[PDB]
Curated annotation (Swiss-Prot), chain A:
Phosphorylation by AMPK activates it and leads to negative regulation of the mTORC1 complex. Ubiquitinated by the DCX(FBXW5) E3 ubiquitin-protein ligase complex, leading to its subsequent degradation. Ubiquitinated by MYCBP2 independently of its phosphorylation status leading to subsequent degradation; association with TSC1 protects from ubiquitination. Catalytic component of the TSC-TBC complex, a multiprotein complex that acts as a negative regulator of the canonical mTORC1 complex, an evolutionarily conserved central nutrient sensor that stimulates anabolic reactions and macromolecule biosynthesis to promote cellular biomass generation and growth. Within the TSC-TBC complex, TSC2 acts as a GTPase-activating protein (GAP) for the small GTPase RHEB, a direct activator of the protein kinase activity of mTORC1. Liver, brain, heart, lymphocytes, fibroblasts, biliary epithelium, pancreas, skeletal muscle, kidney, lung and placenta. It is found in: Lysosome membrane; Cytoplasm, Cytosol. Component of the TSC-TBC complex (also named Rhebulator complex), composed of 2 molecules of TSC1, 2 molecules of TSC2 and 1 molecule of TBC1D7. Probably forms a complex composed of chaperones HSP90 and HSP70, co-chaperones STIP1/HOP, CDC37, PPP5C, PTGES3/p23, TSC1 and client protein TSC2. Probably forms a complex composed of chaperones HSP90 and HSP70, co-chaperones CDC37, PPP5C, TSC1 and client protein TSC2, CDK4, AKT, RAF1 and NR3C1; this complex does not contain co-chaperones STIP1/HOP and PTGES3/p23. It comes from Homo sapiens (Human). This is Tuberin. It is linked to Tuberous sclerosis 2: An autosomal dominant multi-system disorder that affects especially the brain, kidneys, heart, and skin. It is characterized by hamartomas (benign overgrowths predominantly of a cell or tissue type that occurs normally in the organ) and hamartias (developmental abnormalities of tissue combination). Clinical manifestations include epilepsy, learning difficulties, behavioral problems, and skin lesions. Seizures can be intractable and premature death can occur from a variety of disease-associated causes.
Curated annotation (Swiss-Prot), chains B, C:
The C-terminal putative coiled-coil domain is necessary for interaction with TSC2. Highly expressed in skeletal muscle, followed by heart, brain, placenta, pancreas, lung, liver and kidney. Also expressed in embryonic kidney cells. Component of the TSC-TBC complex (also named Rhebulator complex), composed of 2 molecules of TSC1, 2 molecules of TSC2 and 1 molecule of TBC1D7. Probably forms a complex composed of chaperones HSP90 and HSP70, co-chaperones STIP1/HOP, CDC37, PPP5C, PTGES3/p23, TSC1 and client protein TSC2. Forms a complex composed of chaperones HSP90 and HSP70, co-chaperones CDC37, PPP5C, TSC1 and client protein TSC2, CDK4, AKT, RAF1 and NR3C1; this complex does not contain co-chaperones STIP1/HOP and PTGES3/p23. It is linked to Tuberous sclerosis 1: An autosomal dominant multi-system disorder that affects especially the brain, kidneys, heart, and skin. It is characterized by hamartomas (benign overgrowths predominantly of a cell or tissue type that occurs normally in the organ) and hamartias (developmental abnormalities of tissue combination). Clinical manifestations include epilepsy, learning difficulties, behavioral problems, and skin lesions. Seizures can be intractable and premature death can occur from a variety of disease-associated causes. Lymphangioleiomyomatosis: Progressive and often fatal lung disease characterized by a diffuse proliferation of abnormal smooth muscle cells in the lungs. It affects almost exclusively young women and can occur as an isolated disorder or in association with tuberous sclerosis complex. It is found in: Lysosome membrane; Cytoplasm, Cytosol. Non-catalytic component of the TSC-TBC complex, a multiprotein complex that acts as a negative regulator of the canonical mTORC1 complex, an evolutionarily conserved central nutrient sensor that stimulates anabolic reactions and macromolecule biosynthesis to promote cellular biomass generation and growth. The TSC-TBC complex acts as a GTPase-activating protein (GAP) for the small GTPase RHEB, a direct activator of the protein kinase activity of mTORC1. This is Hamartin. The chain holds residues 746 to 794 of 1164 of the full protein.
Length: 138, 49, 49
């Protein structure tokens, strides 16, 4: 499944529009729930590569799906190995934190409570604090 | 699939319509920043000049 | 008709992207030209004067 969906996403980046992505994100959600117990290094590697390609396509903005749910799924798997993915996730979640937007302080609270005050990956916490600095400068 | 694209356009149009609330919110933010800028400048004159 | 609705929803997506870019650009302009200007004019200029 993960190999075939890898060719699906890496090729048909654009044809996957939002209802299809709402399905395909749940496909990834099931895959991630299985990643806990399937345990194989090869499966870990290929699932990580898939989410890495989804992240790349999100930076390329070739991904057109729901960022809220995709980055929620990233958050559930945030506890995992990929490093730059965490930087991307934190930078993304910064968007929902802004003085004009509702609940922004609470969203920032959650962001730091997860990735600042319950985290130890130095670059990740550096980026969280840079995000907070950008929020304060804004 | 026609029904799907219709529901999909409905949903993305709702997402784009929430930016109407976003527009009103940013207009309020402007009506704070600009209005306080004008008040600050006028009192800056009225006292410091 | 499927292709036509695909490009129609794509145009709605384009309007969303354009509106997001325009709101981001106008927020940047508001910041750097009104909020930063007020920061100067009040906190530095008015209070120092």
């Amino acid at each position: 499944i993960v190999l075939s969906i890898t060719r699906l996403i890496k090729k048909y980046r654009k044809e996957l529009q939002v209802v299809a992505w709402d399905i395909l994100l749940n496909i990834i959600e099931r895959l991630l729930q299985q990643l806990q117990t399937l345990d194989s290094p090869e499966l870990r590697t290929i699932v990580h590569d898939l989410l890495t390609t989804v992240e790349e396509l999100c930076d390329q903005n070739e991904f057109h799906g729901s960022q809220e749910r995709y980055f929620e799924l990233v958050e559930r798997c945030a506890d995992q190995r990929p490093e730059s993915s965490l930087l991307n996730l934190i930078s993304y979640r910064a968007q929902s934190i802004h003085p004009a937007k509702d609940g922004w302080i609470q969203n920032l609270q959650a962001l730091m409570e997860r990735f600042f005050r319950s985290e130890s990956r130095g670059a990740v916490r550096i980026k969280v604090l840079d995000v907070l600095s950008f929020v304060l400068l804004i | 699939d026609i029904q799907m694209w219709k529901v999909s356009l409905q949903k993305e149009q709702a997402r784009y319509n929430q930016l109407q609330e976003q527009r009103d919110t940013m207009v309020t933010k402007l009506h704070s920043q600009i209005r306080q800028l004008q008040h600050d400048r006028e009192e800056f004159y009225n006292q410091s000049q």
